[PDB]
Design a protein around this ligand. Structure first.
Ligand code: HEM
Ligand SMILES: O=C(N[C@@H](Cn1ccnc1)c1ccc(Cl)cc1Cl)c1ccc(-c2nnc(-c3ccc(OCC(F)(F)F)cc3F)o2)cc1
Length: 469
């Protein structure tokens, strides 16, 4: 059995330490107990295996030994809906992932760029957020809006985008309640917020299902969004088309996925850029040099030439990746190849790919946000390891890499290229339109709110904006 981490009280264990700051908690535990330990997380023994080998052990674990959906389903199933994601066996997840991956081809991503640019530009023109030549804005609130508009406009389609002008705003706010910290223990309890979650889940499904049906009734296709796509990409291995309900639920899940992860990340980008005016000027000059002084429209093709924009994202993900903790249930006992250790089935296991990304071993002056450290290498997709196809195409199991913001193994992100496209596009447009600065006498960046397993800026962070024109 791995070394149990010292705590003071029963069933609180190291929850508070972990919840306040996972990374500081993991590094301290590391210095005192090595690369493997067990801490009591809300009553559950939770074995943490750190370092690249830890990530490999947990993320490349066999389906026999490690279960994800068992740990997640109580929380996510009420939110996303039935028969998708984690409310099915792995094999079905793998196909659903394949379906979405289908929907995210170059032709799809191509079409999304001018739609995303238009949303950002129209937001900046129309929102109260940025009225005036010079001002302050709430970064997280503003960025969350921009991400929801950009993702729903491109990925979700016209009808959903348009409904965010009326009811979807309130629906998604209420559905998001499902991710309340309390639902890590009572996701099944009919507390008032969960009641609102469910009402919201139901009406959201309803509307999607109406949008789908109304498409069929016109017998037509008009764009590259994931709808027209799942309607056609309905076919499962056994010949069954994905039912309208599963499509609705998949879309809900994809909106939730993008919103949480991307909005957090884009917020951090803005906050970093505000602390680093040198870097923003570089980005601006890169756009001048690589696209021209006339600053022509952003396209899928010319974005990929924005080398520093990409590194700004990569480096931000290195320090601020939204998911800090990947947890699996141990289903059959497992042992650590190089040790006497064995992990019982009363344990969960936890990987933290964020730990290696801010380690001195792998990254010199790790806590320094410097995009230029990537001058050694850049890729929006990088893989030098062996490859495994789990059902949604070939992907690296890559964990010799200390940098895994999109995870690894069968459960790894299939949103990664869309995320880059969206973050890259938002950033490029913002870089054209603005300069950002911290508020008077504020140095550096805000604290991180570690909650709901989603990192984000803590508190209400304003930065100053000035329009270039
Ligand atoms: C910066 C942006 C993003 C980050 C950092 C991110 C991170 C991750 C990580 C770490 C995982 C693995 C989770 C695990 O092992 O349990 C993952 C899985 C996934 N992500 Fe993302 N993601 C991002 C954006 C997106 C977007 C935009 C979408 C969809 C549009 C998406 C859809 C998914 C899906 C479907 C999975 C698979 C879950 C599974 O197989 O169990 N992600 N993501
Ligand atoms: O939002 C989630 N998954 C996203 C991931 N994603 C987004 C972008 N790319 C990937 C997602 C994936 C796929 C798709 Cl299709 C859509 C989405 Cl949105 C998500 C998944 C599982 C869990 C969950 N399971 N147990 C907990 C849990 C959490 C905390 C805790 O104690 C902590 C403390 F102490 F702090 F309180 C106890 C827990 F049991 O959490 C919570 C959230």
């Amino acid at each position: 059995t791995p070394p149990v981490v010292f705590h003071w009280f029963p069933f609180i264990g190291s929850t508070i330490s972990y919840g306040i700051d996972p990374y500081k908690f993991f590094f301290d535990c590391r210095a005192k107990y090595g690369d493997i330990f067990t801490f009591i997380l809300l009553g559950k023994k939770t074995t943490v295996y750190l370092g690249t080998k830890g990530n490999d052990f947990i993320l490349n674990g066999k389906l026999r030994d490690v279960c994800a959906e068992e740990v997640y389903s109580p929380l996510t199933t009420p939110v996303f809906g039935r028969h998708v994601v984690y409310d099915c066996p792995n094999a079905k997840l793998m196909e659903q992932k394949k379906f979405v991956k289908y929907g995210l081809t170059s032709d799809a991503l191509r079409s999304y760029v001018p739609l995303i640019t238009d949303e950002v530009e129209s937001f900046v023109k129309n929102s109260p957020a940025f009225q005036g030549h010079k001002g302050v804005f709430d970064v997280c609130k503003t960025i969350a809006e921009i991400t929801i508009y950009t993702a729903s406009r491109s990925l979700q389609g016209k009808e959903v985008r348009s409904k965010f002008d009326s009811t979807f705003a309130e629906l998604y706010h209420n559905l998001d309640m499902g991710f309340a910290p309390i639902n890590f223990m009572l996701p099944w309890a009919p507390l008032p917020h969960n009641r609102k979650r469910d009402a919201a889940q139901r009406k959201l499904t309803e509307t999607y299902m109406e949008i789908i049906k109304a498409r069929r009734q016109a017998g037509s296709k008009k764009d590259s969004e994931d709808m027209v796509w799942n309607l056609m990409s309905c076919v499962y291995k056994n010949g069954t088309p994905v039912p309208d309900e599963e499509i609705a639920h998949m879309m809900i899940a994809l909106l939730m996925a993008g919103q949480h992860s991307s909005s957090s990340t884009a917020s951090w980008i803005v906050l970093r850029l505000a602390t680093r005016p040198d870097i923003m000027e570089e980005l601006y000059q890169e756009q001048i040099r690589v696209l021209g002084s006339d600053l022509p429209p952003l396209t899928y093709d010319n974005l990929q030439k924005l080398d520093l924009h990409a590194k700004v994202i990569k480096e931000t993900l290195r320090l601020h990746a939204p998911i800090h903790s990947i947890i699996r249930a141990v289903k059959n006992p497992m042992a650590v190849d190089g040790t006497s250790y064995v992990i019982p089935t009363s344990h969960n296991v936890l990987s933290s790919p964020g730990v290696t990304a801010r380690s001195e071993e792998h990254f010199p002056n790790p806590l320094e946000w410097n995009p230029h450290r990537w001058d050694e290498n850049i890729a929006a997709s990088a893989e030098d390891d062996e490859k495994v196809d789990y059902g949604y195409g070939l992907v690296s199991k890559g964990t010799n890499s200390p940098y895994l913001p999109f995870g690894a193994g069968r459960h790894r992100c299939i949103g990664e290229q869309f995320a880059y496209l969206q973050l890259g596009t938002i950033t490029a447009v913002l870089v054209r339109l603005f300069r950002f600065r911290n508020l008077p006498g504020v140095d550096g960046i805000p604290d991180t709110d570690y909650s709901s397993l989603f990192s984000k800026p803590l508190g209400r962070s304003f930065v100053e904006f000035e329009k270039r024109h």
